[PDB]
Design a protein around this ligand. Structure first.
Ligand SMILES: NC(=O)c1ccc[n+]([C@@H]2O[C@H](COP(=O)([O-])OP(=O)(O)OC[C@H]3O[C@@H](n4cnc5c(N)ncnc54)[C@H](OP(=O)(O)O)[C@@H]3O)[C@@H](O)[C@H]2O)c1
Ligand SMILES: NC(=O)c1ccc[n+]([C@@H]2O[C@H](COP(=O)([O-])OP(=O)(O)OC[C@H]3O[C@@H](n4cnc5c(N)ncnc54)[C@H](OP(=O)(O)O)[C@@H]3O)[C@@H](O)[C@H]2O)c1
Ligand SMILES: Nc1nc(O)c2c(n1)NC[C@@H](CCc1ccc(C(=O)N[C@@H](CCC(=O)O)C(=O)O)cc1)C2
Lengths: 295, 285
């Protein structure tokens, strides 16, 4: 009785298709309304160009007007700040994000930049104000970071109620771990957060009916650690050379999949689990912002 | 035989004496300068009145100038917003707070009212900005709620390091439970947060080397559930006055325990004063 596989690629395709339909209906219900996203980039990193082009492409297919603002490396902090203030003020933009990390020849305080974003437009959900709302239970209107939002969605796809269950989150980062605890807590699970200073991590992991691991340590969580029948969510994206693969490299998660799949009732594969879910989540957050403005 | 008693009244007395000397020196460095705190109240709840009096009394004894504004029960959210804006703009007021719960005959969104407060004066640490910083580990730039602060201080009085310990926080409110989890987490403990939807609560509480209870249910946490040698912090104030933990039983299992009264209560006001003296010192800098 091996674990059922949570196909992130398929589930995300479903999500994006439904969002397209919603966007089509919003525009027909309110003629002239145009859900709009904006991405602010500083510099010209190759990886950022790739990530951005993927976000813009997904936005255009759903019917969301996506605006890409690309500033040169010579940009200063005051200029980046000016754009954020203008994006906040632009009533035609419902949600925007600053693509990280910034690429400039000058010193720019990343935290001050991010925190200048108007909370009601913070689709990536990383501002302190938004993090503060999510941490204290304002799930009805705050924004949720794309990765943990995709994790909760995958957990809900199992059909197993979260309330009353014991969930373990290995990792406590701003991007994943912390907001993941927040989603699980406010969905009424009893949550235990682990990290690099956690003693007897194996014994802790073994107590989770729902397990979300986001550590960046390739396959550290062994199958033996998994609680029998648990829902395992693996956010890990670790590269390992493998000449038997088309591009000479494989992607493994933070969980030892092959042995964990024999213990859990539901498990996300890597690649193809949490990863494909992220862009869809940003698109969902964008639509949410558009609908809250429209109301 | 019983657990060591964490005397919050003696410890807070030492903190207050310390803060007093600090305030006295600040005035000697800058004569005429006076750290000022303001407490805004809506309504006339008897318990809120006594709580405010205690805070006013501790401020006076430390040398802090405290102002109490009491609004009638007919107050609207709009009017409360006018006082909050006035207090944000009043340069002589270094730190202010809105007494909770608001006692009005009209609906007033408490979060909107609290979030109108300027974060630099949010000595109660209830704004979404301060909550967000604490929630993500940015402890350099924020005010932490006075109750979780007092609890952390009480835990440190045991002399036992927090890092690596499995901590259990029973309760998740904005005032105590949620920020308490954060403080423990960022102090490197492995933290479990329990609430009303927690199944097998007795089994969860039994895993805690550090146990903080803030539920408001009279002596609901049984001593049987306590892990032998645990540090028990009890934030409960229930009506005789009792905590959220069955003290007589828990004291025979714990290594360190907070009594009620004279435990977390005093420490809470001492920490509020500490955050106030801090907001006055960040203003001079
Ligand atoms: N699907 C996507 O596109 C997506 C998006 C974001 C992230 N991810 C993946 O998620 C992973 C985690 O990212 P992150 O932002 O959370 O990074 P991070 O900032 O480095 O987070 C690591 C966290 O795990 C803890 N930790 C480190 N080693 C551990 C260990 N050996 N045992 C227990 N805990 C350990 C650390 O504790 P301390 O706080 O004490 O340091 C820290 O909280 C990365 O591999 C990344 O590839 C995927
Ligand atoms: N020392 C001080 O001066 C100070 C300052 C403030 C407060 N306190 C004290 O702290 C206590 C709690 O305050 P609060 O603002 O957090 O209260 P609250 O708003 O009523 O919150 C109680 C929390 O505990 C949970 N809970 C209720 N019954 C429970 C049960 N039987 N088992 C497990 N969890 C239960 C609730 O879960 P749900 O969210 O699911 O409902 C809720 O999260 C009060 O007794 C108060 O006197 C002390
Ligand atoms: N929501 C909310 N709930 C609360 O319980 C409070 C609050 N807000 N705001 C203010 C806060 C006041 C904190 C406080 C608690 C106890 C004491 C105190 O000194 N207690 C004495 C006993 C006093 C007596 O009743 O005679 C002690 O030794 O514990 C002082 C401040 C209470």
């Amino acid at each position: 009785a091996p674990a059922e596989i949570l196909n992130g690629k398929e589930i995300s395709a479903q999500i994006r298709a439904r969002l397209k339909n919603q966007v089509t209906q919003l525009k027909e219900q309110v003629p002239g309304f145009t859900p709009r996203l904006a991405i602010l980039q500083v510099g010209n990193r190759d990886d950022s160009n790739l990530y951005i082009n993927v976000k813009l492409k997904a936005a255009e297919e759903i019917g969301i007007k996506a605006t890409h603002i690309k500033l040169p490396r010579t940009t200063t902090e005051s200029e980046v700040m000016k754009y954020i203030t203008s994006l906040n003020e632009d009533s035609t933009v419902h949600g925007f994000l600053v693509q990280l990390p910034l690429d400039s020849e000058n010193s720019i305080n990343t935290e001050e930049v991010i925190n200048a974003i108007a909370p009601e437009k913070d689709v990536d959900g990383l501002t302190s104000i938004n993090a503060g709302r999510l941490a204290r239970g304002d799930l009805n209107d705050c924004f949720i970071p794309c990765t943990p939002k995709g994790c909760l969605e995958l957990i809900k796809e199992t059909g197993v109620p979260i309330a009353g269950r014991h969930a373990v989150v290995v990792g406590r980062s701003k991007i994943v771990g912390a907001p993941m605890h927040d989603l699980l807590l406010w969905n009424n699970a009893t949550v235990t957060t682990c990290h690099s200073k956690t003693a007897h991590l194996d014994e802790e992991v073994n107590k989770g009916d729902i397990l979300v691991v986001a550590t960046g340590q390739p396959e550290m969580v062994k199958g033996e650690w998994i609680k029998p029948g648990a829902i395992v969510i693996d956010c890990g994206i670790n590269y390992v050379p493998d000449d038997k693969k088309p591009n000479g490299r494989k992607v493994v998660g933070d969980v030892a999949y092959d042995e964990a799949k024999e213990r859990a009732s539901f498990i996300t594969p890597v690649p193809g689990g949490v990863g494909p879910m992220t862009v869809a989540m940003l698109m969902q957050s964008t639509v949410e912002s558009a609908k809250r403005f429209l109301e």
